[PDB]
Amino acid sequence: NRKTSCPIKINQFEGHFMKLQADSNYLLSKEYEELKDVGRNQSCDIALLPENRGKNRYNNILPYDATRVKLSGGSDYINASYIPGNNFRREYIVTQGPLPGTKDDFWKMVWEQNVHNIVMVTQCVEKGRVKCDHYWPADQDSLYYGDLILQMLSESVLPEWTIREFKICGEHRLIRHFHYTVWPDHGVPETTQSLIQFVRTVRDYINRSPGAGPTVVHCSAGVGRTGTFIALDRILQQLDSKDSVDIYGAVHDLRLHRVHMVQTECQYVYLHQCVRDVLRARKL
Ligand SMILES: [Mg+2]
Ligand code: NA
Ligand code: NA
């Protein structure tokens, strides 16, 4: 019944987006609403097992059984999902912000899945409410996380993001961690340029890690902000390699694999604004 893709010629995108925004977002809202039920036929029965309750930050934001990531051993559960990219079916893992009680699980996943790049698009605390544990070391001294030892080699705090490098050893690898630090507590970032430049930076590093497993992306719940980051990564790659861009199809594909991947119309609009602004700047 529903469209799975809405490709737009790059030179028609500005006017396409204007058409969507016309009349108080009349058509934009219609297109966005077509995505509403994507993926929603899937269950989350494993995440709901009593043994797993304490492992979910939010008891109503859970991975689908079909696409969840499994930890080795006899407690396999983590609140994390495999997500496709432009390039590969399991190009990302989306997860919640680790809890104090699940940070060892998070690091275990990072080790087992051969992760080399982690993207974080939440603060640990937002207006005094905890959103994510500070699940990495505070300084350069080593610490265990479960059966792994981790050392933070460097921490570089820049105006809109912070980049850390960790050395990890389990049963040695360098991991980079990209922490975007200007996402407002509510709504979308206040400029397009900030997130565009952050995504470009991360994508540069991912491209230099051709051996790596999935890129991990998280916010507090692993929901809209994470979906918006991944959708933007996918769409900007399209702008660099193709004559068409398919924001609708990117969001559709993400929603097939985890709930709330791009979760507000505002985020959907923001993705279109980013693409618009990239194309406008080109024409400089
Ligand atoms: Mg110490
Ligand atoms: Na330790
Ligand atoms: Na929003």
Swiss-Prot record:
**Expression induction or repression:** Up-regulated by hypoxia.
Location(s) in or outside the cell: Membrane
Q: What species does this protein belong to? A: Homo sapiens (Human)
List each copy of the Tyrosine-protein phosphatase domain by range.
28-278
The residue stretches assigned to a coiled coil in this entry are none
Q: Which residues form the active site?
A: 219
Gene behind this protein: PTPRB
This protein's source sits in the domain of life called Eukaryota
List residues in topological domain: Cytoplasmic.
1-280
Binding-site residues for substrate, renumbered to this chain:
185, 219-225, 263
Recorded protein name is Receptor-type tyrosine-protein phosphatase beta
Q: What is the lineage of its organism?
A: Eukaryota, Metazoa, Chordata, Craniata, Vertebrata
| Role this protein plays | Plays an important role in blood vessel remodeling and angiogenesis. Not necessary for the initial formation of blood vessels, but is essential for their maintenance and remodeling. Can induce dephosphorylation of TEK/TIE2, CDH5/VE-cadherin and KDR/VEGFR-2. Regulates angiopoietin-TIE2 signaling in endothelial cells. Acts as a negative regulator of TIE2, and controls TIE2 driven endothelial cell proliferation, which in turn affects blood vessel remodeling during embryonic development and determines blood vessel size during perinatal growth.
- Record-stated family: Belongs to the protein-tyrosine phosphatase family. Receptor class 3 subfamily.
Subunit-level organization: Monomer. Interacts with TEK. Interacts via fibronectin type-III 17 domain with CDH5. Detected in a complex with CNTN1 and NRCAM. Interacts (phosphorylated form) with FYN and GRB2. Interacts with IGFBP2.
